[model samples]
Target: TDLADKYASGNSEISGQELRGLRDAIGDDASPEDILALVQEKIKDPALQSTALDYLVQTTPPSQGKLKEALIQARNTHTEQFGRTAIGAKNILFASQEYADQLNVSPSGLRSLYLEVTGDTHTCDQLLSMLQDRYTYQDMAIVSSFLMKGMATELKRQGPYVPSAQLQVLMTETRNLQAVLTSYDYFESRVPILLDSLKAEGIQTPSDLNFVKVAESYHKIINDKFPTASKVEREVRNLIGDDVDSVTGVLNLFFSALRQTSSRLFSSADKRQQLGAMIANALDAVNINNED
Candidate 1:
């Protein structure tokens, strides 16, 4: 009602007519800013302003088009106000290219596209193929930006001085993106196999996978990191009983049993369920909670 009144009374610059048109053009998901800009230009009622702004904020999803516009605006603002730094420019440029890719827009034909955009001709060509193929869907891809932030923080702590502006920008990007720092931990690979073994047997849900996968990673981290630690030895003995002398020896034994069980189990579904259950039982039995 407030939204309607705002538009009807001409209290809001974003008239109902304009909003409807935009909604039609953009499939009813026209961005908050797109609506907001029109409202600012036309509206004058304070109560309507509060209500409309609230509704816009509450309903707005991240818009690809709006994000592109924002990136362009940010680039312009930075250049005009702060003087251009390569870091800021690079981020905006890359983000623009990514947004264009998302929109299935051909950035290749457009000039003033920086060398960074064109330098990787092979990648550009591949992207062009993707665009042409109507493969505009984006997969979640993360870089090692997370570790970069922690690394920066560690650096700052050790340095006891502010980082350079460039370094600060790098740190910001790294922290914001939180890209993966390294490949999957060793257990990450092993868990899928162990889980495959479990699924092969029949335990094929998140809860079952969670129990087994966690136990696997926990086992690997402790066993590998502290091969001879007394705590590890004590925990391993407590789990499988004291026949084994070392933590690694106990893990090796367990893995061997798992392999044998996988082979003997007649059906994959049954084998997986049995393996997951066994691993869960073994994990519950052992007090191997060494975190580093």
Candidate 2:
């Protein structure tokens, strides 16, 4: 009751002192979105503001409501770069990195800010690797920029460039490509554990650890599952101005952009070739599922 009315005057009454109650009552299962709303409604100086948010994130899956604003603002400001291409990706990572560097977040808390900016979960080591690689990708995005320009020019000849059109290609490549690489990476670690669980069941695998065996064995098990892809399907339903025939033309355009995007992500001709294979198998795995 004290907190309820004490600060009702219009937030003019709030200091970090008043927010202690807000923190205790709030911060409940906080999302990046929630942390953000908290920020919008409040403020303090930047340094201590970070201090409050750093505190909030450690509270649970948590905020400095004010400083938290900077997170989405930074990410949104770079939407052009935020898509599949590398354009401003470093800036995105920097937004997260800078936040953690401000007051030093707990290891898990660090991942929490990444979730705000990335809308995804990233393990510490994987996030570090992503940070290192982001520099490479940012500069490399320049090459792909040329194709996007060229294709979009044709679209303008045909934004007024089939950018929103082709955006999906570079976009899906980064997304789906990562999912492919991610699956392969997850499988590498997940399989030996399967072997451990195997012998527990009196199972043996001198001959093989093929897809059928592994798929059947762990099909329904959910441990160690990671956050992953789904947006591509949604894009289809929400799509506009595009009919089936128009879709065929875009699909035609997509494969062209897709092949180009493959080269842009990795430098190695060999790795690029391997990525093509993985994309096929990944799609194959999906196609077999039928539902999704």
Candidate 3:
């Protein structure tokens, strides 16, 4: 609230000293009731809002003195806002929303969030006056560095090329982020690496000319690989009969495997909203009468 503090963080960007000053400035200004009112309006998702309110009440601990403070405070739990109420909530809403849409982040970009902390993205002389337009909390800069530092241990194995561009083998680390998870291009992009993983796992998705026989082979493979398989897995195999002496029989077996897997997997799918939405688009356009 002080003029000096306001001027320092006025541009609404932070890292290093100026940003840390913003952190201390929050405690000197905000009170508990106003902070509570702010979080309710800003954090749209009920799940995240509840978590925020719980932490705010629990950690800040209702002071008789009435000074509330936070931005990933001493324990890494969040504190709402300070100086201006806008800063903390933007990050709060950003994080809560990011759970559903996380494309913005990649290993390299974490450093972008911290570039102002040390790097001279600007010329030496230009440093006299410049913008440190960091939307995240001041503490977040340290997080960027810390995570990058830890991952740096695998530098040698990651590549025979760029230093920061290291890779993690257990799972793919350098993600092609913009590619949609559902898109055809995404699958095509993964063709080589995806098969590499399959080869490593001893799982063959390929089949002989007769697809029904292949489905049977898969069932045996699953029985070997997953002995304690779920009911759907067991049933999908059991339902596929080897009565295929003709074209119709092969068709019957193939379609039945598809039918059972579709229904059974969709039934067992906890997060079926995406699949359900896809299914909804294929149903009869209009509702039919019960008698008809």
Candidate 4:
């Protein structure tokens, strides 16, 4: 069967079965470059492009290890090229190890985390530069850990239908959390200790708890108030009263309602900011700084 047939006409989505077929077609003889080219040519949608990359990373032998090596080399090259100070070098190496560890867990996880945080390929390309110069090792590790783990858990909890707007809020919260961490440099050293106490109380880890709670709340609101797609169509049909020429008008009305409802559920700018503050307070409560 042709792998392309697996996608709907004019749609970029590829089923898992089709992806497996594509991999089998490529077999062991195909180079990573060939697989990547195939993915780029075939997958046009951004979300599906990321999914295709995940498939490539999994099937390409030694790809994950090679990716890690390349990341470390890039970090070293950036430090040298940018004339990083001795302290910067040390911090970069430390950050590299933390990133490498998670890359070993899932290269796709690392890729998705970077893409989600940075919001585009161009920004993803500049990530090493940011790590080398803009953020400290500790800062990078905490932010990376929170985003990566939060994304993993959110996907597991909510499945793939997680709206892009919802993920944008997650990324925003992570940035805010990074800023909070920066304000209390002492917090990093105390994370493990604080986490230990929280664990004793049967509370989930701090980042996990925050992301999960926010996700749960969003879904609760969605389930309670938002109209189902079928219901929206029905309502549209009722309003149009079988006026065939007005089907497009009905669709526009339905879509407008969806947008309005989704905005109310997903665009909680202040609530997300409050969540960041709560995470910081939870961290700080474990160890109050004398300077404060």
Candidate 5:
């Protein structure tokens, strides 16, 4: 009611202060679905939309069906238009669902964890999606267990409700590390260093490099080599599967599938054009290197 009056001025953009006030006014009275609908249809400011969605998730006890509805609405809006408004809506939906399903907690719990661990909405959503894509909802219990452990460690070092600027720095570092670790080239280069270190440590034989031993060695190398890689690796391992060996086996299966399908899948004219361009670049690089 008060929201209608406040927004009656027909302003093109809603300010964060105004959003806070609107959230205060809507407090606990509006259903999450109604609040989301109002924000999606009426709010033009991305920050304001994000604030509104955060408020809805934090305050409302949403059912799974209601969350699904909200997610569909967000997806539809995102597809219609692309901007911070749409991205914010999708972020909130995914984050809310992931938090609820994995932690068996509300948005408040997620906010607490976010503040404690210090990451932005984008990185948070990306990590959640990565986990969901790999493990689906079936392995959420295992995912939750690992997340709790990670959160507990972070909470021990930081207070809740850190400033946004500091959180941004933390999130940027996280995103950078994610990019590095997910790169096949980076892993290919680094794995040899790991192997050298393992050999020096008496793991000279492939048989000696069992899963537990290799995982321990990899963790040690990651921790020593990069300040943030160990944590990202741990989080990744948790998402893809608990055991690194099992995850690698699964990944190899996919690699095998890709190899089998590569020629057939690349038979299209567009793909052939792309492949020719790639080969030309590769040959040119090789010729230059040979001259050197």
Candidate 6:
């Protein structure tokens, strides 16, 4: 434990002359043989040999602490290293009043929320509830920031030739958009279901359809040129069956249920007031129920 004693005593206390003498006796790189000589010459503890060896193990590095550096680099760069935002958001919604309040939304708000997260409206309410429970605002913020960066990095990592760089970038952008969708669990658990839906609907690519555009169109359709309930019923029966009611009903339920839940959860005077303000702000983006 001469090294321990040396460390405890302070390097300055030991002196340059003393250290040089010890190094000469010990040889270069503080070899095991040199350590043994130093132990035999200066120290009494048998534990010192083990201690000195451990010290050597710790100190003999790529020496710039590259082991730790590499570890940090991997942690920062790896895609799977970060938790999924959707999962995180779901967890938070389940656990925190702050998030649950956000979940208590109107039908349009529900659609807006889903589309905001995933750019699609086909997500399951059950999965959405789960995501609300798992993720927090900070987690969502972090995920959003990383998603853009991660998508770009993954595209670049794929290289310029496996596909054209522009194509790769486009694909990655779509994937990132899908991640937003997936963060909300938009696709069915079965890929076949999604593929089948795509095939049945004749979906080919982004240009083939745009959910945002469709949603915008739907918004316009609802606002300026919506069908009457009887007309809606007729179209429902004619195109997709009475299932259209289910879609509207579900959207309505998400908002109403969310509102009722938020009202209950934020019933306290101070919290209610704060959330009231937030609701007003959130409403500004959606024209639904907007007063002219």
Residue 219, candidate 4: Cα error in Å is 24
Q: Per-residue alpha-carbon lDDT of model 2 for 1-292, expressed as tens digits? A: 3443333223222354645544563444455555545643563322223333434443333145543344344323322323322222212222333333433433123323222223333332333244334322332232123222322333333322123444334443334334333333334454455444544665443335432223222111111132112222112112211233222222222222235442333445554444444333433433454352
- Per-candidate clash tally: 25, 7, 1, 0, 0, 27
lDDT to native, each model: 0.34, 0.33, 0.29, 0.39, 0.39, 0.32
Clashing residue pairs in candidate 3 are 70-79
Kindly report which residue stretches of model 5 are placed more than 4 angstroms away from their true locations once superposed.
1-94, 102-105, 119-162, 176-213, 223-292
Q: Which stretches of candidate 1 lie over 4 Å from their true place?
A: 1-92, 95-142, 145-182, 185-189, 198-292
lDDT of 6: 0.32
Rank ordering of all candidates by lDDT, starting from the highest:
5, 4, 1, 2, 6, 3
lDDT of 3 by residue, 1-292 (tens): 3332333232222212432333333453455444444444554433233334433434344452344443223112222232112222222232222321233343223323222212222321121122113322222323323323333432432322212332232112111111111121222333334334444665443322333233433233222323222232233224332211222222223233333332222323432333222222212111121122
Question: On a 0 to 100 scale, what is the lDDT of residue 10 in model 6?
Answer: 32
Q: Against the correct fold, how does model 1 do in TM-score? A: 0.25
TM-scores, one per candidate:
0.25, 0.20, 0.21, 0.23, 0.25, 0.19
Q: Ten consecutive residues with minimal summed lDDT in candidate 1?
A: 175-184
Off by over 4 Å in 3: 1-33, 40-42, 61-292
* lDDT (10s digit) by residue, model 1, range 1-292: 4444444343223355543333333333334345445434443332233233333433334565564344344333323332322222222333333434544443222112322222222231232232223421122112222123323433443321223343444444333222111112333344456546545655442434332233333333222333333443344444334322223334444444344332212234454444444444444444355332
Cα deviation at 94, candidate 6, in Å, is: 28
RMSD (Å) per prediction: 18.9, 20.3, 20.5, 23.2, 17.9, 20.2
User: Per-residue CA lDDT of candidate 5, range 40-136, in tens?
Assistant: 6555544346545544444334554465345344434533444422332223333433555555554434433433334444443344454444443
- Between prediction 2 and prediction 5, the one with superior TM-score is 5
